[PDB]
Write a protein that binds this ligand. Sequence first.
Ligand SMILES: *[C@@H]1O[C@H](CO)[C@@H](O[C@@H]2O[C@H](CO)[C@@H](O)[C@H](O)[C@H]2NC(C)=O)[C@H](O)[C@H]1NC(C)=O
Ligand SMILES: *[C@@H]1O[C@H](CO)[C@@H](O)[C@H](O)[C@H]1NC(C)=O
Ligand SMILES: *[C@@H]1O[C@H](CO)[C@@H](O)[C@H](O)[C@H]1NC(C)=O
Ligand SMILES: *[C@@H]1O[C@H](CO)[C@@H](O)[C@H](O)[C@H]1NC(C)=O
Ligand SMILES: *[C@@H]1O[C@H](CO)[C@@H](O)[C@H](O)[C@H]1NC(C)=O
Ligand SMILES: *[C@@H]1O[C@H](CO)[C@@H](O)[C@H](O)[C@H]1NC(C)=O
Ligand SMILES: *[C@@H]1O[C@H](CO)[C@@H](O)[C@H](O)[C@H]1NC(C)=O
Ligand SMILES: *[C@@H]1O[C@H](CO)[C@@H](O)[C@H](O)[C@H]1NC(C)=O
Ligand SMILES: *[C@@H]1O[C@H](CO)[C@@H](O)[C@H](O)[C@H]1NC(C)=O
Lengths: 277, 353, 49, 125, 125
Amino acid sequence: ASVYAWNRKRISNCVADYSVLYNSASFSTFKCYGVSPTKLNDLCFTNVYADSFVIRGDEVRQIAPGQTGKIADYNYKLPDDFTGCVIAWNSNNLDSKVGGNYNYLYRLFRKSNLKPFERDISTEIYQAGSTPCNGVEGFNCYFPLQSYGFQPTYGVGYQPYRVVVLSFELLHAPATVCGPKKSTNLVKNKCVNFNFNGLTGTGVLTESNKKFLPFQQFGRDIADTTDAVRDPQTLEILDITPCSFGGVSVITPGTNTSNQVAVLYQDVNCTEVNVFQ
Amino acid sequence: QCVNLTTRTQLPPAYTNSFTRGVYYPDKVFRSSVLHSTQDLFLPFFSNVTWFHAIHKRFDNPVLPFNDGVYFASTEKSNIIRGWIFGTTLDSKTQSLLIVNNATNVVIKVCEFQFCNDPFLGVYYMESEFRVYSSANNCTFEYVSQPFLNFKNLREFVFKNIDGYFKIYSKHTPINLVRDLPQGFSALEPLVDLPIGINITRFQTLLALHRSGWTAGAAAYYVGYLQPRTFLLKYNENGTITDAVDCALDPLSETKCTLKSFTVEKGIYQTSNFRVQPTESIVRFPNITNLCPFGEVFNATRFASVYAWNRKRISNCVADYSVLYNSASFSTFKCYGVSPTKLNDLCFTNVYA
Amino acid sequence: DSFVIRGDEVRQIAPGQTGKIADYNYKLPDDFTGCVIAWNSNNLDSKVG
Amino acid sequence: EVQLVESGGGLVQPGGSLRLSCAASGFTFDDYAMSWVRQAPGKGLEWIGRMYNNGRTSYNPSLKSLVTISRDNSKNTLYLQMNSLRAEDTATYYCARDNLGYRPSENLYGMDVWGQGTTVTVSSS
Amino acid sequence: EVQLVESGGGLVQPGGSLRLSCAASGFTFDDYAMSWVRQAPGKGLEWIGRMYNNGRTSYNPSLKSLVTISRDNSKNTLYLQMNSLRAEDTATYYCARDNLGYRPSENLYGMDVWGQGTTVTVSSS
Ligand SMILES: *[C@@H]1O[C@H](CO)[C@@H](O[C@@H]2O[C@H](CO)[C@@H](O)[C@H](O)[C@H]2NC(C)=O)[C@H](O)[C@H]1NC(C)=O
Ligand SMILES: *[C@@H]1O[C@H](CO)[C@@H](O)[C@H](O)[C@H]1NC(C)=O
Ligand SMILES: *[C@@H]1O[C@H](CO)[C@@H](O)[C@H](O)[C@H]1NC(C)=O
Ligand SMILES: *[C@@H]1O[C@H](CO)[C@@H](O)[C@H](O)[C@H]1NC(C)=O
Ligand SMILES: *[C@@H]1O[C@H](CO)[C@@H](O)[C@H](O)[C@H]1NC(C)=O
Ligand SMILES: *[C@@H]1O[C@H](CO)[C@@H](O)[C@H](O)[C@H]1NC(C)=O
Ligand SMILES: *[C@@H]1O[C@H](CO)[C@@H](O)[C@H](O)[C@H]1NC(C)=O
Ligand SMILES: *[C@@H]1O[C@H](CO)[C@@H](O)[C@H](O)[C@H]1NC(C)=O
Ligand SMILES: *[C@@H]1O[C@H](CO)[C@@H](O)[C@H](O)[C@H]1NC(C)=O
């Protein structure tokens, strides 16, 4: 697509292998924000969106949070809190013709800056002067979309770059997009490490009496730690009790007297560790 | 196809009380037996909610603002309310959002519809009449889903538009109250999040005619507006929001907001601070004396030749460039490196004429 | 440490970088102390074929 | 040096056709918008039309029926094929480049470089 | 457009030599790895060999004794000089580029563009 009319595709209900994209040498720009690129296969994502367009070579700097320019302000705005990856690569052999490829256009003029992830395809005549256009071109009245002149002889920076922006939401809804890690069996009533949809932790998994609403995946306690979780394969609720922690106190006489010690496990029953309760 | 409805009866829209309605779940996280404070676009408690009727001859499809968000309540029987229209100009110039629920399925489309002045559905006494738009040329988003839907049914919806995301929250309530909004509390579950990415400032309710002219079936809906504010929500042992506190409604609930509790012990509690908002701006700058002698330069009797061009230093004076740029005497006025209207806002050194 | 890389891969000779050169050829530690010096050698290391 | 030279003006009969040129030097039309503007003896500059870099043409809506703006990018020149020249079509025709870039001040016409313009008169002989 | 054209197949006597071509268009061999693969009528694709950009050759170790892969970078073409063609050397010979840079699909054969392939048969006449 053009950048003013950037295409958005929903990615859902699939397993995404980002190791074949990040390790590919085809992409000249690969900038991830709010997530590490090597941690992508270990997370599960909800609401994955792929925005695709073609921009100029030196305008790839403007596809980032907090940038200013014609592309950021008038064509494609990213939020300051953006999480996702911006992937760009040179497409001079595909999107340039010898006379000039004019199929890619950008919005040069607008009355106000775009909101984040807002698309403007309106083609009203812009007023760059004092006299109103009344929808008709004239002095200081222009068509707002101008086309790139894409030729193969142009230097790098005036050459077309195909830009795909991936956008994720991190672990707040039930997730439909996951990396290729295989699932193991579900083990309950034991102190185990757990990885539920990219949510890592350590605890004991027990059957829960809580009834989650269908838009809810996990539950948080006072300290915003996940104390209840829904298993993504069999839709059941599990309490996550933290693995048993007990303060250890070393009862001793002086080392001048003896080296014998006793140990106290505070608030710990004797069957979960000269035994005295 | 468009049809003007010319048998309406003129009547102003009504107003009533919101009570404690419009509360939705702020996130998708389960919470139990907790008091959670959240700051979001909420409907204020006991607010002035606008009331529109469909009765026979009332048929209320006006043009309403969207503002920051819309709470939409519906006291409905026999299925007259069918969907909504969102947009800015509601024509083919801009891009508009269609949500409909016809006799088969729920359709959401983001297209440049050339909307009718009176968009409607129709039931013949079966649905065989649909006049909402005359064209649809450039469509970016389509989404076909399940059916969302004495007055017997209560429909609450919350429409929000943040960062190109349209959040729709919904709640369905069995009621048996005749005329007005029931007084009670019901937290709205999230229904759908749509990546529409369009500007929305105006919206339309879509109704359905009954034909046997036209007849309007008995229905009533309510429009309220969301404001950014803080609620203290109470989550019970079952994870359901059972009560809420508006933190800026009255000083008692503001004390409940400050103490993070729904019960307040007897005493005095410093809860807030009274401040007096500034009303005007007063800028006082000293007398504009010692004007620069531009009258001695432009209105001089003799001027120099170009090979022997005269140079005059202008310094230690206040220069009014607004009388030069707005003067119609000068045929050429070309400024380089500085805008002519920004000249009075700058201070200059080494001025030469 | 001396080697020859591509012109646009000099970005990857830094602590914490990823790429074919950093991950598969020459890894710098995150606690690296020292100086990375690079210069164009097109007149020395390029032939016409 | 960026310089616009027009040619092709002169006497022309009523109801005929006359082709005008805007042979440009110092710049090419692959990245610039180009405009045609007329000038009556008793009136101001009246905008005729505009050629974009992608080939898009816009015209004066009171003058669309009888003007045509085309390019010849191989010869980097602009063409204006006018037909049915009447008495009010007597004008001095300037060809100018549009300023879509940085403008140092407010321009009434929005042109960064102008042409010398060619004069066309319509009469009996 | 990236397009691989092979030529040189046909009838060939037992024990002779036959030279095949992979005249390529749309890309050059200065930065790409190129492979030759055969195809029996009753068996699958069998990899014959690979030419790298630096001139490095690798072959099928059951087929090293009778194949030779060479380049002609001036004519951007690949050559395959096969000798001592027997009955089982009847094959349709594809020339393909190796997709070293990217793996869009999990390709079993690991090639992104193929050739049409040329057919070679070995018999009495
Ligand atoms: C229904 O009524 C509306 C309001 O009068 C009509 O909209 C107007 O139609 C005329 C016809 O050309 C236009 O000149 C006006 O500009 C329209 N008004 C607005 C505000 O745009 C509408 O056309 C009527 N429906 C039908 C089918 O005639
Ligand atoms: C959205 O529309 C309103 C009115 O139609 C306008 O004032 C506002 O600037 C628009 N927003 C953007 C980002 O263009
Ligand atoms: C697969 O997962 C779905 C929901 O994610 C569940 O309904 C189904 O029972 C699961 N099947 C198996 C074999 O685990
Ligand atoms: C609601 O608004 C109307 C006019 O906007 C006003 O007359 C009415 O008094 C308001 N109701 C309340 C309860 O303030
Ligand atoms: C409801 O709308 C959809 C979308 O256009 C359409 O396919 C379907 O036929 C409609 N059903 C009825 C009963 O109008
Ligand atoms: C919108 O539709 C009109 C008419 O169908 C078309 O000319 C225009 O190119 C379209 N715009 C986009 C961005 O598709
Ligand atoms: C919570 O649910 C239980 C059944 O699981 C029910 O007995 C109890 O009354 C409920 N409490 C509230 C406050 O709804
Ligand atoms: C020059 O004289 C004219 C004549 O009216 C006057 O209006 C103008 O203010 C004078 N110029 C200046 C700079 O004072
Ligand atoms: C990628 O596209 C090219 C041409 O569009 C095609 O030849 C190639 O097979 C495609 N690759 C895959 C893996 O589909």
